[PDB]
Design a protein around this nucleic acid. Structure first.
Ligand SMILES: [Ca+2]
Ligand SMILES: [Ca+2]
Ligand SMILES: [Ca+2]
Ligand SMILES: [Ca+2]
Ligand SMILES: [Ca+2]
Ligand SMILES: [Ca+2]
Ligand SMILES: [Ca+2]
Ligand SMILES: [Ca+2]
Ligand SMILES: [Ca+2]
Ligand SMILES: [Ca+2]
Ligand SMILES: [K+]
Lengths: 109, 115, 112
RNA sequence: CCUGAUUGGUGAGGG
RNA sequence: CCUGAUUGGUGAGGG
RNA sequence: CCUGAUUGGUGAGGG
């Protein structure tokens, strides 16, 4: 589905303030398989898309929230990296309240 | 690490380190711990989770299981060494004589549940 | 006291104790060590009262072939063993210097 | 050779 | 061999 | 009860 730029900015902001996160397809997938992932953010410009094509299905199966952001380069920066990130998983939010809200807004779509 | 057979909550890890600190007689280090388990005098074996190469302590869980000796884990070898009264790390510790029988029995039971 | 030990040699006995890597302090631990055959040298204080507490040691060591000697005071022996109190007897399990022990055991074995 | 505790019961010293 | 960062958690290094 | 370290690995504490 498509997420509004307003929300994406909030998603990127959410990753930036998070206390603990996982960066990278391998670690994100593990975080979801272990169920320690609270929210999963996925980049829309991942090529080949096959790298993250399995995430949406896995999250729903594990009952974990997930949304998309336009830039993997932007997602990586929000994760504290100097390089891109195809996906990120928030393990410990920065502001519990905001997260619960952000998650609800996403679940709407 | 593959040698860590089960997850021990941080609160219980604290209890394990406390047990080591209050113990009347312990063995510290892989060689003395292994000798104690083989001699059958260990009552509880505590293994650090961050030992590398893992091969140094990987035999302990299996050995204890064979001897019917209780074992558990703590996250840091540095913390375990400190609890054992050292200024350095310890990959493992064996409690030979606990400080209080009842406390040990309760702790061992809590571990057997996590097991 | 089966034999007399020169003050100079008693000093060496006390120093051997202080330098040892592993010792047993006290009648029960000394006796257990001799019985288990891990004691290399037993030192007995001469002013133990009742003397019955350590009376068995000379015979036990002889029966085990373990070297033993005496020192004037239990207070000094205890201090040498690292205690703040007296010790009726001490057993050296692991000395600090092999050569020295062998030399001391010799000096004592000739005094007997 | 230089570095200098970044090492360490993952086994020192002694027997 | 040349180019020289155009590559990149899309998994380096380590165990 | 008083004395108050005169006691003490000549075996405390723990298992
Ligand atoms: Ca250090
Ligand atoms: Ca240091
Ligand atoms: Ca050695
Ligand atoms: Ca670039
Ligand atoms: Ca670049
Ligand atoms: Ca590729
Ligand atoms: Ca006194
Ligand atoms: Ca006193
Ligand atoms: Ca008495
Ligand atoms: Ca007792
Ligand atoms: K590393």
């Amino acid at each position: 589905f498509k997420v509004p730029e307003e929300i994406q900015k909030e998603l990127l902001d959410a990753v930036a303030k998070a206390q603990k996160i996982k960066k990278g397809a391998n670690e994100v997938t593990k975080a979801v398989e272990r169920g320690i992932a609270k929210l999963v953010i996925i980049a829309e410009d991942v090529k080949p898309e096959e790298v993250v094509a399995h995430l949406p299905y896995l999250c729903e199966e594990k009952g974990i929230p997930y949304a998309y952001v336009a830039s993997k380069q932007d997602l990586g920066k929000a994760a504290g990296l100097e390089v891109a990130a195809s996906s990120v998983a928030i393990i410990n939010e920065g502001d519990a309240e905001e997260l619960k809200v952000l998650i609800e807004k996403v679940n709407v779509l």
